[PDB]
Curated annotation (Swiss-Prot):
Impact upon substituting residue 216 to T: In AIS; low androgen binding and transactivation
Source species of the chain: Homo sapiens (Human)
Entry domain remark: Composed of three domains: a modulating N-terminal domain, a DNA-binding domain and a C-terminal ligand-binding domain. In the presence of bound steroid the ligand-binding domain interacts with the N-terminal modulating domain, and thereby activates AR transcription factor activity. Agonist binding is required for dimerization and binding to target DNA. The transcription factor activity of the complex formed by ligand-activated AR and DNA is modulated by interactions with coactivator and corepressor proteins.
Impact reported for residue 84 to A: In prostate cancer
Organism lineage: Eukaryota, Metazoa, Chordata, Craniata, Vertebrata
Protein's name according to its UniProt entry: Androgen receptor
Disease: Androgen insensitivity syndrome: An X-linked recessive form of pseudohermaphroditism due end-organ resistance to androgen. Affected males have female external genitalia, female breast development, blind vagina, absent uterus and female adnexa, and abdominal or inguinal testes, despite a normal 46,XY karyotype.
Range covered out of full length: 673 to 918 of 920
Phenotype upon changing residue 86 to A: In prostate cancer
Consequence when changing residue 83 to L: In PAIS and prostate cancer
Modification after translation: Ubiquitinated. Deubiquitinated by USP26. 'Lys-6' and 'Lys-27'-linked polyubiquitination by RNF6 modulates AR transcriptional activity and specificity. Phosphorylated in prostate cancer cells in response to several growth factors including EGF. Phosphorylation is induced by c-Src kinase (CSK). Phosphorylation by TNK2 enhances the DNA-binding and transcriptional activity and may be responsible for androgen-independent progression of prostate cancer.
């Protein structure tokens, strides 16, 4: 039942709308990454709200958890796409936005990209199954919260525990749980580096000709700083 649901709600293909019939430029590549980020966020919201037990969360915490975990969720999924679509040879942000090393460099997000490429390879080296991937991604949604607590922390704690239990079941073991939780933990530092880069870019966006969609500008200026200033932190296993 649980896995039937995760498979059923898994987002389909999302395109960036990027113009690949034009020479690469920082401004065009980043505007497309931002646009793709917003397109994916729309799907992450619909995905999250259809997750088993998500409605158990207080209305106020439902949106907060999505916004705080959004980047990490995208990173994990992108890494899986890169692994399955091109065997980690390139970063598969979208069918129309595939990054080779030249683009990783041009984007000025090279360090972050190489770490995501490594994550992509991890899916292969650890022989992560599609089902482990699905359960792990759902768990990512409940892996970062405010130090001052959610409106109803207890309901969140219950749901997160339930998702960890589903992972236990998929695995069923100690050695595998160790590997998977280690992998999950590695996503956070990557999201953090992307958060910092996105924040800095938004602040100077008007100086580099980079367009930020309304919805993205809001999250990056209201939610992301809570994470960067230490008010909202990831829940690490290790
Ligand atoms: C630079 C920025 O546009 C900030 Br939102 C960005 O990180 N976009 C973005 C768009 C899509 C994906 N993605 O589909 O996975 C990601 C990723 F998570 F890779 F880093 C990032």
């Amino acid at each position: 039942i649980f896995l039937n649901v995760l498979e059923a709600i898994e987002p389909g293909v999302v395109c960036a709308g990027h113009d690949n019939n034009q020479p690469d430029s920082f401004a065009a590549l980043l505007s497309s990454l931002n646009e793709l980020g917003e397109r994916q966020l729309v799907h992450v919201v619909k995905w999250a709200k259809a997750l088993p037990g998500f409605r158990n969360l207080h209305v106020d915490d439902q949106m907060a958890v999505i916004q705080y975990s959004w980047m990490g969720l995208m990173v994990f999924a992108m890494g899986w796409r890169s692994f399955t679509n091109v065997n980690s040879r390139m970063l598969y942000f979208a069918p129309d936005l595939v990054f080779n090393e030249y683009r990783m460099h041009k984007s000025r997000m090279y360090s972050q990209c190489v770490r995501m490429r490594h994550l992509s390879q991890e899916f292969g080296w650890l022989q992560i199954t599609p089902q482990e991937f699905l359960c792990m991604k759902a768990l990512l949604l409940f892996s970062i919260i405010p130090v001052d607590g959610l409106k109803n922390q207890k309901f969140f704690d219950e749901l997160r525990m339930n998702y960890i239990k589903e992972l236990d079941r998929i695995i069923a073991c100690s050695r595998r749980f160790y590997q998977l939780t280690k992998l999950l933990d590695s996503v956070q530092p990557i999201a953090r580096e992307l958060h910092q880069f996105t924040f800095d870019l938004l602040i100077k966006s008007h100086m580099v000709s980079v367009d930020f969609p309304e919805m993205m500008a809001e999250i990056i200026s209201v939610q992301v700083p809570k994470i960067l200033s230490g008010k909202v932190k990831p829940i690490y296993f290790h």
